[PDB]
Amino acid sequence: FEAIFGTFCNRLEWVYFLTSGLAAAAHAIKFHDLNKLTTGKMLFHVQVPRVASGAGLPTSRQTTIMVTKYSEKSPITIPFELSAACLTYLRETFEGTILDKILNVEAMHTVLRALKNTADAMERGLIHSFLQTLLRKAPPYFVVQTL
Amino acid sequence: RVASGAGLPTSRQTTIMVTKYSEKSPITIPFELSAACLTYLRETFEGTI
Amino acid sequence: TVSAPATYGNFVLSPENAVTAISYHSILADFNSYKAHLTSGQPHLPNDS
Amino acid sequence: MDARAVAKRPRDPADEDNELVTALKAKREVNTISVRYLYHADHQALTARFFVPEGLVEFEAQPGALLIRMETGCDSPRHLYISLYLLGIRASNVSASTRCLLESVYTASAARAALQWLDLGPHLLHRRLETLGCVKTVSLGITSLLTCVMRGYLYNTLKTEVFALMIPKDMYLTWEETRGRLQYVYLIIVYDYDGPETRPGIYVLTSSIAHWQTLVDVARGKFARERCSFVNRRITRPRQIPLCTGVIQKLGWCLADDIHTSFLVHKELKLSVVRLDNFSVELGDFREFV
């Protein structure tokens, strides 16, 4: 005979944005109505001190600058797929036999496992996109040291 | 998987199976005995020291 | 100092594995547990055989 | 089977739970995903996804246009997805000003390669082209993503607004003065054989006629000069094998009151178009008339 020992399913490990150290670099705000808007602007108002000049030299003026900061959009996507077997068995029963029960259990577990994997992948994609937008804007060392 | 931006490629939901097998390697060793030893072990003659 | 197993482990060939080997020509370890879990509706295995 | 089950009203996707909701209800588990209502669930329109080079996307940055697949016999990408507006640069049925404007706007590198491929081969436009219906999204880049409908009512995702289809003014043709409340729109290609080149004309035709025989009758009536040109080339130059003075393809049904005239702007350049808002796509294949 041919002997098959214990079969193993992968013990996939979960990860989250908040649990990662990168979350400390970030501020995270959730907003259920984000789909409707595409503009986010912040404004800064600053008055710069001027030292009173000496005799004869040109004098300074009361001066201010006003500057605005804008938003970057970078949505992320993940696809996941279901076969016809799971889709038809998830909403049907055939004679109520034991094998049909096995198929129903398999279909339900398959779709829910796919949903769980997609959620984990979405969290990974969110942290990935945050790193992308952070790194794409960071200048190198020599320029900042020269500055 | 990890997500990506619209227009960029996306990773298909994927699974894989692997089947490790087994190996065979027996072992042997002989041990000897002497004929006089065997015959004295089996039965005894007239009782003497 | 460290604790170690004092003897070899014993593996039992179940009677259901006998009929599976005779007819199906295969032996599934801990077969009764497999049948019970399959009919119960829990896919995740209790522990390695 | 039982009488009550037979008499019972049909199943109601309108309020019955979606499959993912059923599964998560079954295990009593909740993911962070807003799983309840699926977008595009009620969509009837059949959608395709197409990738296109960056040069061609101009005038598609405004939603709504005909997307055409053209052939190239090279081993490297065999098909290139072209827009109807760019195709007008080849037609002899375009005024000089409009052709000059289109020639100036589409001067990106990729576009001119398609124009070379269109006329570098012996075959006419008829055998080279095929229609893919109407395009309705943009995602720009070095390579851009288009989404397109091949049997459809033309709408945004939430159906918050209907999307129109725009046709350039020079190509638009009508063969009746009064319009019934329903009329179909067709793609028309005709060829001039008197000139040295087989010079093609590009037309879009709206008509209340659905039956092929009468439509072809009217077409042969109006295109008599082009038909005479075909016969003239056939008699004049033997061992040449011309064919199909004109070809027809059916592409659309629309409610005639919907038609409007509008202007279209891109790259702060201004184009004149005709517009059909409450449009729908029905696709047939090309067919020949002589």
**Two structure tokens written together for D155:** 């709408």
Q: Is residue B11 within 8 Å of B1, Cβ to Cβ?
A: yes
Residues 6+ apart with CB under 8 A from D86: D56, D59, D102, D106, D111, D114
Q: Among A78, A112, A127, pick the best mutation site for testing chain B contact (most B Cβ within 10 A).
A: A78
Task: State the method.
Answer: cryo-EM
- CB-CB neighbors (< 8 A) of C45 in chain A: 6-9
A4 with C49: Cβ contact below 8 A: no
3-state class (DSSP) for residue D63: coil
Gap between the Cα atoms of A75 and A79, Å rounded: 14
DSSP E strands in D129-227: the ranges are 129-135, 143-153, 165-168, 172-174, 182-192, 199-207
The Cα of B28 is separated from the nearest Cα of chain A by a number of Å equal to: 25
Gap between the Cα atoms of A116 and A43, Å rounded: 40
Q: Which of D63, D61, D69 is nearest to D87 (CA)?
A: D69
Please give the resolution of this entry in Å, rounded to 1 decimal: 3.5
Partner-chain residue, chosen from A4, A6, A98, that has the shortest CB–CB distance to C39: A98
* HSE-CB for D51 with a 13 A CA cutoff: 8
In this structure, what are the phi and psi dihedrals at residue D49, rounded to the nearest 5 degrees? -115, 130
Gap between the Cα atoms of D290 and D273, Å rounded: 30
Gap between the Cα atoms of B39 and B42, Å rounded: 5
